[PDB]
Amino acid sequence: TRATSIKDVDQHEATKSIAHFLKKSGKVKVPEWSDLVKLGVNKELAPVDPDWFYTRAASLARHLYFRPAGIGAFKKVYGGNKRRGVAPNHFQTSAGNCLRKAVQQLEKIKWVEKHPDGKGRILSKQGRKDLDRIATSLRS
Amino acid sequence: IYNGKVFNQTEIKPEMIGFYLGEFAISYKPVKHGRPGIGATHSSRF
Amino acid sequence: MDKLTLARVTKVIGRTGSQGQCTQVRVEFINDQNNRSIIRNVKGPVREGDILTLLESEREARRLR
Amino acid sequence: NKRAGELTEEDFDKIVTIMQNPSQYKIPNWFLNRQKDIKDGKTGQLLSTAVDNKLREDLERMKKIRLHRGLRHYWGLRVRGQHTKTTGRKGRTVGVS
Amino acid sequence: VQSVQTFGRKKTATAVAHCKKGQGLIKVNGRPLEFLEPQILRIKLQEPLLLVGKERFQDVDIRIRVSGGGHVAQIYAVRQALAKALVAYYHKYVDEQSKRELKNIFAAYDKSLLVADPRRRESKKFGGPGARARYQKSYR
Amino acid sequence: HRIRLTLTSQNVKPLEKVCAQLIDGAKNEHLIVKGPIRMPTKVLRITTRKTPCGEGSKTWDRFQMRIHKRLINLHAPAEVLRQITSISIEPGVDIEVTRA
Amino acid sequence: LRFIMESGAQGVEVIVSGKLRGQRAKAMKFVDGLMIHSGHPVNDYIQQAVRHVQLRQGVIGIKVKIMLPYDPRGQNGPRNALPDHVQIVEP
Amino acid sequence: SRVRTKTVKKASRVLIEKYYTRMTNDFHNNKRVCDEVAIIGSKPLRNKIAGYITHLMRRIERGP
Amino acid sequence: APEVALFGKWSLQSVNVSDISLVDYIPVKEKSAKYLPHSAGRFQVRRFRKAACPIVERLANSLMMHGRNNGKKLMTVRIVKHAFEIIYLLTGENPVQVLVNAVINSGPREDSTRIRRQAVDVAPLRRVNQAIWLLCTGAREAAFRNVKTIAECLADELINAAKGSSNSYAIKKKDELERVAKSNR
Amino acid sequence: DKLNNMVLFDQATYDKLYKEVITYKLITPSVVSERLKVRASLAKAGLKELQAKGLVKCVVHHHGQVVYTRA
RNA sequence: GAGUGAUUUGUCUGGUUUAUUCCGAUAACGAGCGAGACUCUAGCCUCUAAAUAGUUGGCGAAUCUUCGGGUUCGUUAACUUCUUAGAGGGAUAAGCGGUGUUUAGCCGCACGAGAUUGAGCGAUAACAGGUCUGUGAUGCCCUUAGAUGUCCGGGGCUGCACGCGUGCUACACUGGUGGAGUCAGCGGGUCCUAUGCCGAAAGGUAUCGGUAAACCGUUGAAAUUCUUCCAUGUCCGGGAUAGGGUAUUGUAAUUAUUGCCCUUAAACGAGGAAUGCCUAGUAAGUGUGAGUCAUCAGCUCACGUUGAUUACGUCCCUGCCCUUUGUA
């Protein structure tokens, strides 16, 4: 009766499973500098996990399941508080290249179309299918 | 180079390429201190 | 060494102390055949029916003027 | 995720080689602390005593050419335009009379 | 079509609960009650069910739409809306005796389960950083 | 077609009086009038130092102006609008018609 | 003051400040009738004006405040009575 | 606090003297009769007058 | 009606307050049996309204001090839950009972005031308040700049206070206060 | 005096962990580190080892605290 | 009325009130201002309405499904619960108990959303208080072209042995670091800028929409929540100081405008004598908006989010109010 959609399961497990599936598919092309960059100015170090690209793409897909968005919107989503040293902290947007590349990879995998009104990206006819299948696989 | 009051004479060496002219004509005078006066501190204010 | 005496607060005389932090209270001993009543100085908020635990009960506070 | 004490010597030689020649191992020029050197024009990373040596050389160059920044450096004052009226005091209080 | 609509309020968070004849469904913003953040404030959402009884909850489908405020405020608004929706359903489609029993149980446990807490932020006043606090005074 | 009457003011009483006059006219004419749609009020705040100098305690004047907006939707191709609009006027309220 | 009071005002206050007599400035205040100072009804019942006069010695400031009368017809004053004035309908 | 000002007291006295017949012991009734018998410029003021009128009625019943 | 258990793990109806004085000032059972120690209630509108706030609620409220940690009631509730779990895992009886015993044992029964001082008795409400404050302060001081976590420090403080051993900061402070007051009699 | 805490287990500390630690009623990285003079990270890593081997029951597994008990 | 008079009484013995607020007594009677009332604001609830707000459906569509349901778009009717803003109601010491001078009121209970929400206004009489540097507000004095008018080009207002005030950042596991997951409000815009594409970032580039409940924008803010590593080490706390490179504003950036990348990484181990602010959605923590604004916020004016400990008193300190009293 339950666990027929992404909203019906824990989002931590959901994004974990989405990243696992995306890695297994092997159709995602991780960018060359993946192990060379920070995910935003507010961050101090590069990601600890070498596979951070797959996790970021999984998070992007999971959020697109909830609401259509664009690169700037996802920059706000993944941005955070930046410590300016001796000055007080302030909000800072994340980088943009990583989100753009992940979204383009999802489009390649056919998990993301463009909004019919041409105002961002929406989870695809196949993206919804795949994500709901992952959710019902989570089940329990 | 005018420093606001006078023209400081300066020869342009090859070492000054890539620098502003004003950086070689100081506009102020280095400070040498003078035994603080009455208003300094709070004991001498009276 | 005076037995721990538990006394209920029958009524509150009024505030006292340099800054009015203490309260004068009339207290009635709980386990007491003669039902002993005295006046004590208390710290902190106290109301009627509160049970105080006097370490020694021979002392009596001076009545408020 | 491993303590440096568990690491063998050849690993350390590998790492130092990468550090001395970052450009060979696809480390971009924007990742280095000495890019487009004012004298040589090379882009490299200054390691160990090279950092102190280059700092000394830069200060000497600026002072010798009598740049405003060099003069302030050699006088011992702040060089980035900070106010020096109240902060930066590391001396002894001086009385009046 | 047996259906009622109620609302719970707290600070600025407001939750609107639609309760209709159903098969024992509890949804908030499309997510199950067991996957809401923060995790510690989940027994708060379960308190209505625990106190009143799931036996008298499985007959309804109740969907809650919460917006505004923060996480704690939204949790409290959601629980209040849940209780009020159940009471309204039992007032409009069940006997007043069960209505009174429901109200008695909820009120006896917690008064805030049924009536909104009126506390709201007090406006800041110049000369200080907040409503009552004042900037430090230097007397010399 | 949909005629949009937008009425704006800084005072509620004249604005409501004009709205009521227009609704009464439309009803009398037997028109398809859509009730007064009340837009959120716009509050323009100016907080200023009371003193013309820098002396004294820091006291502030909190001036504010309020703007209220009303919308009316009409289905009226006939010449009746000009009559209804022209008859009812009131100072402080500005009206305009749009052919949406 | 006399003209304003005869015109029907509840009260009037006229203040003239400046170098009226001698070098040191002074303020002269003339009050007649009853006048309110605080509250919202001030905005409705009180009418104020300020002006300046340049005489040989300097500038003199004039302030005039008039408390309008309760006019039910809304011509000589506010149409609404004072909030604290309760009027009784005679039986 | 809860001390009625001379405005409220005088209004209540005048209303009781002039409309004793319409003044009953019920606060809602006194409020209603005040609404129609007096022009009061503030609802809180009217409610204060009605409350003090009820309080006065309670004493009038007991004695002069 | 179902029985209410704190955190759905600890029973309240089996808890007893030894001090008849503090029976009416330590709310645990009956109307005070609340599932979570996080209830957004107004316990300061009147004087003694705070006496009805659940004791675990009071502990959580007092743990969120030293403004570095101001407003973090959720973190403090997590700390309390972990500490209670450690209490049960270490001693064997109800952690809420252990907390009640610690509160009963940590309250000074006589103090000093400026009326040189004068020895005075302590009202039950202030007794409970000071017990809670002393326990929380001891846990905080023990945890500061230590490998031991705040939860472990709180667990140790509560266990020592409940046992009455002169190792808890709260018991030591209580003894200090009573001894000074006795000297000042 | 500084805490000279080792970063990786010595053999004596290792068999000490495998013999006596499993016998404690209360098992946490802090207490284990205090007892065996090891870093808390190493203590908790060894505790995951013990949990995987099944010699300890995990009771609390928060990111800010982990607690184990004898099995 | 009392005094030759300056002046008194009214304007009080007493009780009460935040209150010269009331009761009452009364050589005074009758009044005014101030207080209160009042305006805005916060609740909580019933009539008006809502193709610039939304719901309940109905109808198509596309996913999953444990087959009974769940999620999801694209839309023609019913309705205003939610949203908005008009009109009203509601709370006042009215009801019960006690107390009080058959008062004024006070305490508790009940009913309740609420049994003192916060602001604005704010009297007589004064200060040699600040402002001539806000003003085509201004007397007098000075100056009026080798100008104290105005403009133009540079420099300064930032200059540093030192003392003081308001602040920001920290001193750490109630933590920092890499992830993952999510909740605002006040309000702003011709300038906000969506969305594509480029770039490691900063930012660049083509421009949708909006002069606005229509677009920015469902304003995806932080603190906070769950996980990973680090574990008492000045270290993965702190990020001052300094070197190199690099974007953008602007005629111009040196005395670094600001931001971005790498590197350097200081004092600080909870702060002496002293001293400030604060009673509930408050303190404290946390970020956002606006003012300033070509660029520059650690400042101010507001907004929400998380949310307490303590007291419900006293006149001891610092002061204020009223009366009597003494005064060179």
Automatic annotation (TrEMBL), chain D:
MF (Gene Ontology): RNA binding; structural constituent of ribosome
Biological processes annotated in GO: translation
Q: Where in the cell is it found?
A: Cytoplasm
Question: What domain of life does the native source organism fall in?
Answer: Eukaryota
Q: Tell me the keywords, alphabetical order.
A: Cytoplasm, Ribonucleoprotein, Ribosomal protein
Listed GO cellular component terms?
cytosol; small ribosomal subunit
What does the record give as the function of this protein?
A: Located at the top of the head of the 40S subunit, it contacts several helices of the 18S rRNA.
Q: Which family does it belong to?
A: Belongs to the universal ribosomal protein uS13 family.
List the protein's name: Small ribosomal subunit protein uS13
- Native organism: Caenorhabditis elegans
Identify the taxonomic lineage of the organism of origin: Eukaryota, Metazoa, Ecdysozoa, Nematoda, Chromadorea
Q: Which gene does this sequence derive from?
A: rps-18
- The full protein's residues present here are 53 to 149 of 154
Automatic annotation (TrEMBL), chain F:
Sorted keywords for this record are: Ribonucleoprotein, Ribosomal protein
Q: Can the keyword Protease be found in this entry's annotation?
A: no
UniProt domain Small ribosomal subunit protein uS10: residue ranges: 4-98
InterPro entries listed in its UniProt record: Ribosomal_uS10 (IPR001848), Ribosomal_uS10_dom (IPR027486), Ribosomal_uS10_dom_sf (IPR036838), Ribosomal_uS10_euk/arc (IPR005729)
CC per GO annotation: cytosolic small ribosomal subunit
GO MF annotation, one: structural constituent of ribosome
Which SUPFAM superfamilies would you find in this protein's record? Ribosomal protein S10
Give any single GO term for biological process: translation
**Pfam families named among the record's database cross-references:** Ribosomal_S10
Under the heading HAMAP family, the entry gives: Ribosomal_uS10
Name under which the protein is recorded: Small ribosomal subunit protein uS10
